[PDB]
Design a protein around this nucleic acid. Structure first.
Ligand SMILES: [Mg+2]
Ligand SMILES: [Mg+2]
Ligand SMILES: [Mg+2]
Ligand SMILES: [Mg+2]
Ligand SMILES: [Mg+2]
Ligand SMILES: [Mg+2]
Ligand SMILES: [Mg+2]
Ligand SMILES: [Mg+2]
Ligand SMILES: [Mg+2]
Ligand SMILES: [Mg+2]
Ligand SMILES: [Mg+2]
Ligand SMILES: [Mg+2]
Ligand SMILES: [Mg+2]
Lengths: 65, 36, 188, 127
RNA sequence: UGGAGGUGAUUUAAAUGCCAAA
RNA sequence: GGGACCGCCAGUGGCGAAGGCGCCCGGCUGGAACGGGUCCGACGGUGAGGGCCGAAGGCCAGGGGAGCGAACCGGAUUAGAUACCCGGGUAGUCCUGGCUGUAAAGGAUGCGGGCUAGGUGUCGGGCGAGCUUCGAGCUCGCCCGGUGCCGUAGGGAAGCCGUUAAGCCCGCCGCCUGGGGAGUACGGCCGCAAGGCUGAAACUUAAAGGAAUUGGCGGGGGAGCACUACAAGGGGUGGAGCGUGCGGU
């Protein structure tokens, strides 16, 4: 309902039609899946140590090269 | 018909298969007009 | 209404046939005891006897008799897993198959599929010789034993060991197996 | 003791079907497809639709006493494609997250030994 | 290093060449 | 219950004159390689006329009909869409007995014989040596016959070919003589039909055709770049009246 905080640990690379999306790896900080590491797509500038708020934690982005 | 493999090249002409079909259509008509 | 129709079902216990131990293998729901007949259940050999080696052997049991909440089964067929056989077949080896129709001592009709893998490519005459050896061994075993003993030796690996030992004289081998068994008819 | 069932998963390029039955295969517990959870034809084969359908099926099965399942996943096979669509693994993962135990996993796509001829002529689709 | 084969796929629509050069 | 088809193993691997031939067991039958102090004794090569074989499709009689699918009937796309795409569907594809005799039927390379550096794979037979779980097994070397690659002399317009010649020599048969008109007209033979084999002229034309080079282009591939490109943003022009430049009248 209020989402789950996750923390950025690694930057993978840019993607998207116009290069506007970045793929990152995050570690969940709260909820049922605390501690798990999954990769995600993020819009906007981001750096290591940022914290995202996820509305769901069972979708994982397709790996890029 | 006799083979002329030079005719199958496509530069500056239409496809040989369809020229052959057109000729055969035209030959049937002359044959039918002969027997009458 | 739909939840009402579900509550009418009862759960029946399924047992393995007599010569496999007659142990419990699972439960099936059904509203009328007659509808349980002829249902088929597949289990691995590892469940019947604990050993992590024979986990790619699959057995089929078919229901024939219901008494109370228990259903009893008969042996129907055996098969090896697809991923296991698909891993033995490689390039630069040779695969020999032979499919035979047999009758046991007590008039049971079986069809048996056996397979052999050789270390390299071989000539077709050597394939024919190996296939002939397979046919001889299987016919003799079928004439020798009863249905239950034949099935037990077929799944325990004894027949395959005999076939490999006999066929090493034509070419060194990599594997030898009974790939598949299906029961075709029963005595009267 | 333990009531175990079977999850049949059918995956193509156009849709996904998740069908939970009992151990013998003859009695149906639940059955959900992609077109029952999403409204766009374009989204029927997507992984997210697979997750939604799998969750619905798992809940319906859990309420009726099933504890775990064995999984049988298939493509259309036959003279059609032999490769499962994108929604197979997503459906497999969502069953375990919903509370069922998972048994053995195998694929049962039907494969011919040189059978019937495929549609499209001797040149195939020309797009 | 340079070659020869095989099996798979390949995300809407998109026709034409006039004044000239003289 | 039914009709068609034999996956992986499978290999510039095997067999056949070519077309073609891939589930297993049994019967009949054709050809080739190797081994050979065996027999005959030039019995040979090519082959005008003539004969037989010959993918798919088609035709004539009788069966069969699962899947696919000319014609055709619907749904879309489009300026139109007699198409490409989607849902159906007759002939045909399959079996028996005949006719037809055609393919980029291409190794685009007719067949027999002698000779002219090497190197390296693989299939069949034989010989020698060494191993071995004693296997119709494994490794290495040599001879003959098939089947691939790289290459010296030589050849060639070049691409390339090179003991599997497109090299040097000894034979026989077939075919060609600038581009079109034309594989047409007329005559003849063959076929149930569809068609096959044979095959000119009047006239027209200065090139047609081959192999390779430098660029330019692709609704081909890769690598890079730009606020007169986009993405993320801030402000606008296009609607009104007026200043000024241009077309027209
Ligand atoms: Mg020529
Ligand atoms: Mg739907
Ligand atoms: Mg198009
Ligand atoms: Mg143009
Ligand atoms: Mg159609
Ligand atoms: Mg050919
Ligand atoms: Mg040899
Ligand atoms: Mg050779
Ligand atoms: Mg060379
Ligand atoms: Mg004539
Ligand atoms: Mg601009
Ligand atoms: Mg912009
Ligand atoms: Mg204005």
């Amino acid at each position: 309902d209020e989402g789950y905080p996750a923390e950025v640990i690694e930057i993978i690379g840019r993607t998207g039609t116009t290069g506007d999306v970045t793929q990152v790896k995050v570690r969940i900080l709260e909820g049922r899946d605390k501690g798990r590491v999954i990769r995600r797509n993020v819009r906007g500038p981001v750096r290591v140590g940022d914290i995202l708020i996820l509305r769901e934690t069972e979708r994982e982005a397709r790996e890029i090269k | 018909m006799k083979r002329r493999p030079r005719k199958w090249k496509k530069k500056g002409r239409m496809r040989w298969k369809w020229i052959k079909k057109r000729i055969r259509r035209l030959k049937r008509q002359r044959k039918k007009e002969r027997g009458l | 209404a739909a939840k009402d129709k579900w509550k009418l079902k009862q759960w029946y216990v399924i047992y393995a046939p007599d010569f496999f131990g007659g142990v419990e293998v699972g439960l099936t729901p059904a509203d009328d005891p007659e509808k349980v007949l002829n249902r088929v259940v597949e289990v691995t050999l590892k469940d019947i006897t604990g050993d992590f080696l024979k986990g790619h052997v699959k057995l089929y049991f078919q229901v024939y008799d219901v008494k109370g909440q228990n259903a009893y089964t008969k042996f129907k067929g055996m098969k090896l897993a697809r991923s296991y056989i698909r891993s033995l077949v490689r390039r630069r080896t040779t695969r020999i198959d032979g499919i035979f129709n047999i009758t046991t001592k007590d008039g049971y009709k079986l069809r048996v599929m056996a397979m052999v893998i050789a270390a390299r490519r071989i000539q077709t005459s050597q394939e024919r010789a190996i296939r002939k050896i397979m046919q001889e061994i299987i016919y003799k075993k079928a004439e020798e034993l009863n249905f239950k003993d034949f099935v037990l030796e077929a799944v325990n690996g004894k027949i395959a060991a005999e076939i490999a030992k006999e066929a090493k004289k034509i070419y060194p081998l990599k594997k030898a197996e009974i790939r598949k068994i299906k029961v075709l008819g029963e005595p009267e | 003791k333990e009531k175990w069932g079977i999850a049949h998963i059918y995956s193509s390029y156009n849709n996904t079907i998740i069908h939970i039955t009992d151990i013998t295969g003859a009695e149906t517990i639940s059955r959900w497809s992609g077109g029952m959870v999403v409204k766009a034809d374009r989204d029927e084969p997507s992984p997210y639709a697979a997750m939604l359908a799998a969750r619905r099926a798992a809940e319906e099965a859990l309420e009726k006493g099933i504890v775990g399942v064995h999984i049988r996943v298939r493509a259309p096979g036959g003279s059609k494609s032999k490769t499962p669509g994108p929604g197979a693994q997503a459906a497999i993962r969502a069953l375990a997250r919903a509370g069922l135990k998972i048994g053995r996993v195998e694929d049962v796509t039907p494969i011919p030994h040189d059978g019937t001829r495929p549609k499209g002529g001797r040149r195939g689709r020309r797009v």
